[PDB]
C-alpha cells in the first residue's frame, strides 16, 4: 500500500500536471511530445527540483501504463561503463519495441557519475541511432559531462521551486492528510527549504509526528523550529543585536544561553547571521570583505569539528572587528 511509503515517495508526481514550479520547461516538453518533435533532453538542476519525476511522468504520458517495459532507465546504482554502453545501450537503440510500435526512450538518470570513456562512446550512439530512440540525461553538475555530449542534447534548467508552487504542493499535502498549518508556520517552512520539496515533505511528516495529538490542533512555528532544530528569527536577531551593541561578556552569555536553551547549532546561527547581514547597507566594502572571509573560515573549521565555545567566541570577535571598521 502507498500508506507505508514516506511522504517524499508517496507524493511522487505521476502525471505532468502534478509537477509544480517548472512551467516554461513543462509546457515546452508537452508541446514537443504532442507535435512529435522530441529532441534529446538534458535536465540540469539541483537535487529535489523534480527532474526524475518529470521524466517519469513524461514517459508515462508517452507510452502509457506499460512505461516500465518500453523505456531503458539507467542510473548510478547500475553499472554504467563503456562495455555496458556498447552492449546494452546499442542493442536497445538498434532494436525495436517488444510491446508496441514507436520510438524508444533511454533515461540516463544521474549521468554525471559516468566515465569519460562511456560518454565518448555514447556521444556517437546518440548521433547514429536518432530516428528510432531518444536520450534523456539528468544532471546536477554540468561540469562532469563532456562538451561533445553536452552539445548533442537540448538543455533544460530546472529552477528552484518558487513560493507559489511550493505553497500549492503544501496545500495539496494538507488536503491529502488530516493536518492544519499556520500561515507564519508555512512561511517559516518555505524559508528553510531553498526550493527543495524533499526537505519540505520530510519535515512536514516529522512535525505531524511531533504533534502528539489526534491532529485536532494546528502546526505553529514552534513545532517546525523545535522539530527541524532551526533557530528562530527572534533569537537570531537577538544574538546579532547583543553582538553588535552589547558588551563582550554579555554577548558571550547571550550566545551561550541562546544556543543552549533550544540546543541550536553554531553553523545554523552562522548561516542565519550571514543571511541577515546581507541586507545591511554598509560602508566601505572592507568590513564586508573581513566579515565574509572570517565567517567562511569559521564555517570551514566547524565543518571539521573543534571547540564550539572557541568557534562561537571567534564568530563574535570576527563580527565585532569587521564592524569596528564602520565608523
Amino acid at each position: 500500500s502507498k500508506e507505508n511509503l514516506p511522504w517524499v515517495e508517496k507524493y511522487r508526481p505521476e502525471t505532468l500536471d502534478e509537477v509544480y514550479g517548472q512551467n516554461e520547461v513543462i509546457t515546452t516538453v508537452r508541446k514537443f511530445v504532442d507535435e512529435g518533435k522530441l529532441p534529446h533532453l538534458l535536465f540540469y538542476g539541483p537535487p529535489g527540483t523534480g527532474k526524475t519525476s518529470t521524466i517519469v511522468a513524461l514517459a508515462r504520458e508517452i507510452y502509457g501504463k506499460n512505461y516500465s517495459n518500453m523505456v531503458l532507465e539507467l542510473n548510478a546504482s547500475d553499472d554504467r561503463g563503456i562495455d555496458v554502453v556498447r552492449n546494452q545501450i546499442k542493442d536497445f537503440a538498434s532494436t525495436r519495441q517488444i510491446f508496441s510500435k514507436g520510438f524508444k526512450l533511454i533515461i540516463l538518470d544521474e549521468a554525471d557519475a559516468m566515465t569519460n570513456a562511456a560518454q565518448n562512446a555514447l556521444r556517437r550512439v546518440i548521433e547514429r541511432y536518432t530516428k528510432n530512440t531518444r536520450f534523456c540525461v539528468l544532471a546536477n553538475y554540468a561540469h562532469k559531462l563532456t562538451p561533445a555530449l553536452l552539445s548533442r542534447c537540448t538543455r533544460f534548467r530546472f529552477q528552484p521551486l518558487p513560493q507559489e508552487a511550493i505553497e500549492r504542493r503544501i496545500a495539496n499535502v494538507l488536503v491529502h492528510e488530516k493536518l492544519k498549518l499556520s500561515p507564519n508556520a508555512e512561511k517559516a517552512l518555505i524559508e528553510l527549504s531553498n526550493g527543495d520539496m524533499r526537505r519540505v515533505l520530510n519535515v512536514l511528516q516529522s512535525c505531524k509526528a511531533t504533534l502528539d495529538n489526534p491532529d485536532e490542533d494546528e502546526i505553529s512555528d514552534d513545532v517546525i523550529y523545535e522539530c527541524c532544530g532551526a533557530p528562530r528569527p527572534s533569537d537570531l536577531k537577538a544574538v546579532l543585536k547583543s553582538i553588535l551593541e552589547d558588551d563582550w561578556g554579555t554577548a558571550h552569555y547571550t550566545l551561550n544561553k541562546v544556543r543552549s536553551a533550544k540546543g541550536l547549532a553554531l553553523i545554523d546561527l552562522i548561516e542565519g547571521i550571514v543571511k541577515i547581514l546581507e541586507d545591511y547597507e554598509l560602508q566601505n566594502e572592507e568590513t564586508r570583505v573581513h566579515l565574509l572571509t572570517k565567517l567562511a573560515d569559521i564555517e570551514y573549521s566547524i565543518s571539521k569539528g573543534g571547540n564550539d565555545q572557541i568557534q562561537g567566541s571567534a564568530v563574535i570577535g570576527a563580527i565585532k572587528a569587521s564592524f569596528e571598521n564602520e565608523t
Binding site: 516500465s68 531503458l72 536497445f92 538498434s94 532494436t95 525495436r96 517488444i98 510491446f99
Partner: protein, 254 residues
Amino acid sequence: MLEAKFEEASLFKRIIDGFKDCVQLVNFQCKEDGIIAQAVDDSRVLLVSLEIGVEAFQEYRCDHPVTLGMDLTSLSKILRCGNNTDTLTLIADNTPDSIILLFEDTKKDRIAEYSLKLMDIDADFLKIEELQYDSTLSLPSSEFSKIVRDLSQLSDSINIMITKETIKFVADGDIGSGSVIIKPFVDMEHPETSIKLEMDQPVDLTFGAKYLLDIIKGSSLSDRVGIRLSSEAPALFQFDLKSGFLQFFLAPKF
C-alpha cells in the same frame, strides 16, 4: 500454497539451467493447472517462459495460487544438491517471504532443505506469442547447438533465412564468412532426426549470437527444438517437456 514434488530433482535443475546466465530475476507462479515462470533480460531482447503441467510432477497440490520472484543466481547456487536422482519438493505458503526446496533420498537418510529469500517483482507476465508465424521449423537440438556454435565464432550476428525447402544460417565478420544450409527431410529410421519446415512466407532475420548461445542450452531438455519466425515479432525457440515446455522469445536485430 505451493507444493510441487518432482520425481527427479534433475528435471528442475535442467530447466533452471535454461534461465541461467541470460536472466537475473525470475517470476514463478504456481496455480491449479501447474507452474509457469517468466524472466526477461535487462536489455529486454529475451524472454524465457516456462510451463510445467500438473502431470509433470509426482505430487502437486494447489488450492491457492502463489506468485514468487527470485534471483536466478541464488536459485542455481542451490540447485546442485539434487543428486539428480534425489526427489525435489518446492514448498511455499500463500504469502511467502521464502521458497523452500526440499531434497530427499528414497530412504529417510539424508534430507537437504533450503529456504531461499524471495524478491518482490511487479507481476506483469507478457503474452507475446503469435497465432501464426511466417515460418516454422524443428530439427534436433544438438544439431541447432552445433549450427549456433559454428557461426558464433565468426560474428556477433547470425542470420536465419528461410525460402521454400531451404533453411540457411549465416555469419559474416572479420575473419570471413560462414553458412550452414539444411534441407527438410523425413528419416523413418528414426524421425527424431528429421528436419521439418513449414513456410508461409520467406523470412530473413538477424539475431545476436550471444543470445542464440544462451538459448541452445534447452537441448538438455528436449531432443528437438522448434523455431518459429516472423517479421512482425520476436522469434520463438521452443523445447518441449513431458507436460510443458521451455520457450525463448528473442527480438530480431534492427
